[PDB]
Amino acid sequence: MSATLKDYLNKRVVIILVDGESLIASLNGFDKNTNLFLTNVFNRISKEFISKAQLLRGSEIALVGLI
Amino acid sequence: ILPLEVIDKTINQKVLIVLQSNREFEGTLVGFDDFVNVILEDAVEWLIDNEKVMQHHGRMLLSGNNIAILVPG
Amino acid sequence: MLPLYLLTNAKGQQMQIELKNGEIIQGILTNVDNWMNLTLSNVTEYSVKLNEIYIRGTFIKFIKLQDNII
Amino acid sequence: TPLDLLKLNLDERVYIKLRGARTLVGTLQAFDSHSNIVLSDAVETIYQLNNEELSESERRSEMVFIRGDTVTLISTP
Amino acid sequence: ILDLAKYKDSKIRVKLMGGKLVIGVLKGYDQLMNLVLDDTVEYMNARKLGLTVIRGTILVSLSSA
Amino acid sequence: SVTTEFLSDIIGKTVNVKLASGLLYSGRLESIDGFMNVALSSATEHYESNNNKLLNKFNSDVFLRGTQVMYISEQ
Amino acid sequence: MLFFSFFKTLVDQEVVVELKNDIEIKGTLQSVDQFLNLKLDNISSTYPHLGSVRNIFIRGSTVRYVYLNKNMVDTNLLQDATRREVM
């Protein structure tokens, strides 16, 4: 058996980065190294808008939760 | 000219090896490999920016993982 | 789609890259390999103008893409 | 060879050094080649500095998986 | 994706992982992106290393100078 | 290779293994592999240098992680 | 692959995951992969401020510890399996 981020696809998610920061976005693509393609990215500590569409590298990611 | 040919060239000469950190090694190049794990002889270890940490005597396997710059001389 | 496929299909677009040291690289994507190493042209580098710059994928944090990228 | 010499002391108490002033001591249930570790009856010791003074802290678990990347030195207490 | 051949005998700017800027004239290279640079100056202020090899492993960024 | 032959000539010798942290380990080298993992006996630790204040002494063999090892020097 | 097998042995089990970032997360091990990434269901504080999230996906290379119970593991098998592995 394997673990796929597939069940999160095209849905809103929370990302926690390794620097401890928080993001909210929509997961529209991922790879094996868990690089992510995210849409409507928002920071949470400031609720500030970040990006309409951004590519986030796996090595920055601690964690992804579904919301 | 190829980088690895320059390192083969400087074998049995003085070499400065600079890590990604503020630390270096002067010594006589004795060998290397494809990963550029270097073997030095009587290496003088420094912390820069300077402190002579040590004066080694003999052969030192210096791990390639953190090598940044090779300076012949 | 796949972040790599999406990236290659974005040559010619202007984008903004954050590096791991927090430095910002802004410019138009000229090429991508499979390691997400990048060449950009029309390069401006924040913390400086350049013609072309090569970025190592492992040193990338994230990439701000064009809003019109669909 | 050193990984096989580690096979030596399974089910025997060992002393692990992690990075970041951490220390673990436990029986060694299982390990591998990245030195990912399982310990039973572990106790972790972190050393911190608060207000410019050293303070240690303990933490106890019965079964614990340890990622290998942080591990510095495995020995015996 | 980057043909170093067009940077040869030119002044290039090379950012290393670890916070180490190196400026020099490209004199050679391989596919792993190991460089040979001459008239090399390193910044971390600044000092002049002569003829240097740069590992591609710790290369983070390359441009022109 | 020359590096691999270093690794059969110094076994049983007294070495200084430094780690990324700067922590220095001195011992008789029991064993060593390719990933630069190391086994040492009668190992003393010091920070940065052999002549600094002894931090620990190990009555047993010490396993040193390869990916942590900065160099392996001999005396 | 030893630890992939091991982790496959604790599916459906409650576990406590301590991040390298000092974030602790209790929840039910739903899934593991090769990189030792973990999918947890029914997560809870044993912890960061999150909204309403049931399932997560942790990246393996960002975990420090996974806390387990001794009931969850036949240590004999663990040792003998560890004796088998080649280094």
Can you give the residue ranges of every domain in chain F? 1-75
Neighbours of D70 (CB within 10 A): 19
Using CA atoms, how far apart are residues E38 and F69, in angstroms rounded to an integer? 31
With the CA atoms of E3, E6, E12 and E13 taken in that order, what torsion angle do they form, in degrees rounded to the nearest 10? -30
Using CA atoms, how far apart are residues G58 and G47, in angstroms rounded to an integer? 14
Using CA atoms, how far apart are residues B40 and G83, in angstroms rounded to an integer? 37
Q: Which domain holds residue G5?
A: 1-87
Helix (H/G/I), strand (E/B), else coil: E58: coil
Structural domains in chain D (count) = 1
G:61-80 residues touching chain D, CB 8 A cutoff: 61, 63-70, 72-73, 75, 78-79
* Cβ–Cβ gap E49/B69 under 8 Å: yes
Resolution in A: 2.8
Nearest CA-CA distance, residue B15 and chain E, Å: 10
Q: Which of B3, B20, B66 sits opposite E30 (nearest CB)?
A: B3
Region of F74 on the Ramachandran plot (φ > 0 left; ψ -120 to 50 alpha; else beta): beta
Using CA atoms, how far apart are residues C43 and E18, in angstroms rounded to an integer? 23
Structure-block tokens of residue B3: 């980088």
Structural domains in chain E (count) = 1
Within 13 Å, how many C-alpha atoms sit on residue A29's CB side? 15
Neighbours of A63 (CB within 10 A): 27
Show Cβ contacts of residue E54 under 8 Å, excluding neighbours closer than 6 positions. B3, B68, B69, E14, E16, E22, E34, E35, E36, E37
In this structure, the strands spanning A11-17 and A22-30 are antiparallel
In this structure, the strands spanning G14-19 and F69-74 are unpaired
CATH number of B1-73: 2.30.30.100
Is the Cα dihedral D7, D11, D17, D19 positive or negative? positive
The fold for domain F1-75 equals SH3 type barrels. (2.30.30)
Torsions phi, psi for F54 (to 5 deg) = -60, 130
Using CA atoms, how far apart are residues E5 and A2, in angstroms rounded to an integer? 44
The fold for domain C1-70 equals SH3 type barrels. (2.30.30)
Residue A23's beta-bridge partner residues? A15, A43
Torsions phi, psi for B64 (to 5 deg) = -70, -25
Q: How many residues does chain B have?
A: 73
Within 13 Å, how many C-alpha atoms sit on residue C44's CB side? 5
Method: X-ray
Residue C26's beta-bridge partner residues? C16, C44
Structure-block tokens of residue G60: 């393996």
CATH number of the domain encompassing residue E34: 2.30.30.100
**Looking at residue A6, what DSSP letter applies?**
G
Show Cβ contacts of residue B40 under 8 Å, excluding neighbours closer than 6 positions. B15, B17, B25, B27, B28, B29, B30, B56, B59, B60, B62
Show Cβ contacts of residue B73 under 8 Å, excluding neighbours closer than 6 positions. B13, B14, B15, B16, E50
Q: Are G18 and A16 in contact (CB under 8 A)?
A: no
Q: Are D31 and D38 in contact (CB under 8 A)?
A: yes
Q: Buried b vs exposed e over G61-79: b needs ≥16 C-beta within 10 Å?
A: bbbbbbbbeeeebebeebb
Structural domains in chain G (count) = 1
Q: Which domain holds residue D4?
A: 1-77
Domain extents in chain B: 1-73
CATH number of the domain encompassing residue A45: 2.30.30.100
Q: Which domain holds residue E25?
A: 1-65
Q: Which domain holds residue A16?
A: 1-67
Chain F hits for B53, Cβ within 8 Å: 48-49
Nearest CA to D47 among D24, D68, D65? D24
Structure-block tokens of residue E55: 């590992």
Helix (H/G/I), strand (E/B), else coil: C56: coil
Q: Are D4 and F61 in contact (CB under 8 A)?
A: no
Where do the DSSP E strands lie in B1-73? Answer: 14-19, 23-31, 38-47, 51-55, 59-62, 67-72
Structure-block tokens of residue E45: 């202020």
